């Protein structure tokens, strides 16, 4: 395979490594490295801990971006400091269980997989060792996404280019943290030690936490997402195990690929869209008003009570034509 | 803003205030009033009670109907007879959390919000005070919908008008009523008193009841929906918090906007469609056969056992070409 | 009704009786017989038993295949060896609750229903006796599907024929098996005896098992699905009560009708699709790589832990352009 090679420096979510939308480049071999890290993390503002397993140290794993017809060459590394075997499966790839059947590595090993990016869209990647370990590694955090762009960039299905000013990757994670008799969340010394209680809970299908970027409140405060009035923002949303229903509170999905695949035209003007468990989708919005927005799953219990809220802070001029407070709160006459 | 003003007299669901589909009117300021009512109601045929919170006294709140480019001016009233602050957020509107950030009112206050109807479709509106109160006010009943019609009326995406003879609004409500030790549903003296037990249940994500129009059996008997053979009926369906899968038993969705937005063409000939939690959708059907139909969510446990069944009673002539009982029940030969 | 009659010999899922895609035949009366069987079956590899109720002895019931404008004439038989009344409702049919209101039969009776196939697609059929019996009979196994093909066969929405080399029918069943105090699954002597415990569990909305073709591992081993590289395979997927999110691990949905209705163009290049509870959908894929694939619902807990995994074994030549292991597992340098 005699094509040019290009290295990518991955960046942690919700940011996305620099890339072209439309490109004059032809196919390349695009090189990525992912290093697995098992670690105990804090997932809420109460201090609840969680035995996480991650690609590159983050939940979600970083977004990889390539173009149709590129070859994606990933070096997957499982350092000896980890305890379990791992692998990687790309929903964008064809054959061998998405790559999982060619990438099983013990602690202390690495492997190099290449796949051709023949399908456009956003796609999940995740670990999938085998059997009951599959769901457990996924819901422990071992999932991310890849975006395969058309070489002409995105379009609206009517001949017009859609160009985003910025892209964010929101990875949503369903987490299953057991409770003790008195009702407090349990802590564990290792992923192995967490397994029996965690599996019992998993099979009841109700998460204790549903978070963006790994933690309640991760995408708030200093880490709110940002935009300006006038900017077109692409929001890639993934969920490797469980459905979600994204919604931008105060905005819309101007152009939405809820099934996430760019061979299909986007839908327009949505209020709420739907990410099937095991998939990524994408929505574009051009901001029209300044201020705070919340980006949620619109099961509001999950959003407000289980963790699944991000914020945007948007700068610019208020548009009184679009919305105005005609009369401020006052006593009823 | 120097446009003509038009008042609307809202009507209780499942009915919809009179309106034009295609119109020669230009943009107007369309005036609506919503008066919040907290009240204890009965939600099933066993006499289970529920601490409801409502717009205009109903679950769902009434359907508001306007046209693209209208300005919607709502007077939201929170009488002093209520106990909590409330607001309103319109998924159809742009900015300020859908209006919620401009409409927070204490008991004894009112506020007037105006928003421009720049997106066509059916959309949820709901209360969203802040934080954990958001899901609680929604699942207590504080949600409804608005329909923003194209000025040329609805179309099939192929150049042909779709005109409905009648429209119904089915609002679906997931309710969380705790049980006591012996397993009976609990009753509470106030919404505040219901809150701790109700929140604990909410976060487990399983409703005790799933109802249309506020109560088991609301849209049955004297209050069945009606049609005649030959009539094209639009059914708007909303669910502000939780997914639903509508189905007309014995019929179809001839033209369905499951994501609910008229900038997208309808899908045709569906058996079951999908309303994402946090959205409204719409389906049109031209009745071909007389008799009873059930309109359900097609999780049949929720439909038959938790409350989510409506009926249509349809008049007209039976069509033996479409369906016939060739041989009535008889002993096996 | 003076049309030619054609008998079909139904076959057990996941196979599908022989049929034409595009046809030069005009409308016919196509004759099917379904014989209800209540029986206790084993549903997992641990030996858990289940009080099943079936059409033709299988879960799902067999796939019926006809063309648009055919008349489907079904003889439904409820032998005296059964204990309960049953009926049949076709989501493909118009009127009388899909046929249910014309087909209620006691043990020892049969009935003959005819309906005109005016809507194209794949559709659920199921028993629906009335009231709380509706969900119980469905989740006990009394559901299958029918496929109504265009007379010109399937198309891609752009003027091109899609022709499948083979079709499989995957029926997914949510099952509710109660547990005793110590946590073992219960066994029952009759469906009637299982009813009280089973209904209590049903209304909590969480299945104990989610299976394809009636049992954990049914579509594995000797009974794996098969294909060759180059073959275009149609996979019809139904779920009469509960949502599913199909995914072909290592493949894609090349052409997908997730709402299942052929009057709509397929979506292309999907990773995961969505079957609404109460519906059937269909996906086509042309295999490009040999080896084992898993076909799952991509709630991986349900797939790996509750039963919902099938396999394909695919013959042919590996394509190193599409995917290759560049470097086998090795020690990290
Ligand atoms: O981007 C995928 C397709 O989108 C649209 C364009 O008409 C087509 O040329 C392009 O191939
Ligand atoms: O109604 C939204 C659109 O629907 C279609 C029509 O071709 C277009 O003119 C219209 O603007
Ligand atoms: O198959 C349904 C329809 O699909 C497409 C074709 O353009 C149309 O002629 C056909 O009727
Ligand atoms: O945006 C993608 C869509 O746009 C088109 O290329 C042009 O309408 C379609 O063929 C494709 O499905
Ligand atoms: O029905 C709405 C749809 O109809 C069209 O106007 C004409 O095909 C499309 O542009 C739009 O998406
Ligand atoms: O595949 C079905 C689709 O294909 C067409 O016939 C041609 O584009 C559409 O009218 C229909 O929705
Ligand atoms: Cu792993
Ligand atoms: Cu996967
Ligand atoms: Cu409120
Ligand atoms: Cu909302
Ligand atoms: Cu039955
Ligand atoms: Cu049904």
Write a brief structural summary.
By secondary structure, chain A is mainly β. In chain A, 8% of the residues lie in helices and 40% in strands.
Layout of strands and helices, then pairs:
Three copies of one chain form a homotrimer.
Chain A: E1 5-7, E2 29-42, E3 49-55, E4 63-67, E5 71-78, E6 89-90, E7 109-116, E8 121-126, H1 133-139, E9 143-149, E10 154-155, E11 161-162, E12 166-175, H2 191-202, E13 209-212, E14 225-228, E15 232-239, E16 246-249, E17 253-257, E18 267-270, E19 279-286, E20 291-297, H3 300-306, E21 309-315, E22 323-331
Parallel strand pairs in A: 1-2, 2-5, 4-9, 12-15, 14-21
Antiparallel strand pairs in A: 2-3, 5-7, 6-8, 8-9, 10-11, 12-13, 15-19, 16-20, 17-18, 17-19, 20-21
List keywords for this structure.
homotrimer; mainly beta; Immunoglobulin-like; 6-stranded mixed β-sheet; 5-stranded mixed β-sheet; 3 helices; 8% helix; binds alpha-D-glucopyranose; binds beta-D-fructofuranose; oxidoreductase
Radius of gyration of chain A from the CA trace? 21 Å
Largest interface: A-B, 46 and 65 residues
Instruction: Please work out how many helical segments of chain A DSSP would assign.
Output: 3
CATH architecture of the largest domain in chain A: Sandwich
- What ligands are attached or bound here? alpha-D-glucopyranose, beta-D-fructofuranose, copper (II) ion
> Based on the structure, what is the oligomeric state of the protein chains?
homotrimer
- Major sheet size, sense and barrel closure of chain A: 6 strands, mixed
What's the CATH topology name of the largest domain in chain A? Answer: Immunoglobulin-like
* Shape assignment of chain A: globular
**Considering the protein shown, what is the CATH homologous superfamily of the largest domain in chain A?**
Cupredoxins -  blue copper proteins
What is the spatial order of strands in the main beta sheet of chain A? 13-12-15-19-17-18
Query: What percentage of the residues of chain A does DSSP assign to strands (E)?
Result: 35-45%
Helix fraction of chain A?
A: under 10%
The CATH class designation of the largest domain in chain A is Mainly Beta
Distance between the termini of chain A: 79 Å
Pattern of helices and strands of chain A? EEEEEEEEHEEEEHEEEEEEEEHEE
Count of strand segments of chain A: 22
The helix/strand class of chain A is mainly beta
Protein name (chains A, B, C): Copper-containing nitrite reductase
Family (chains A, B, C): Belongs to the multicopper oxidase family.
GO molecular function, one term (chains A, B, C): nitrite reductase (NO-forming) activity
Domain Plastocyanin-like (chains A, B, C): 45-151, 167-318
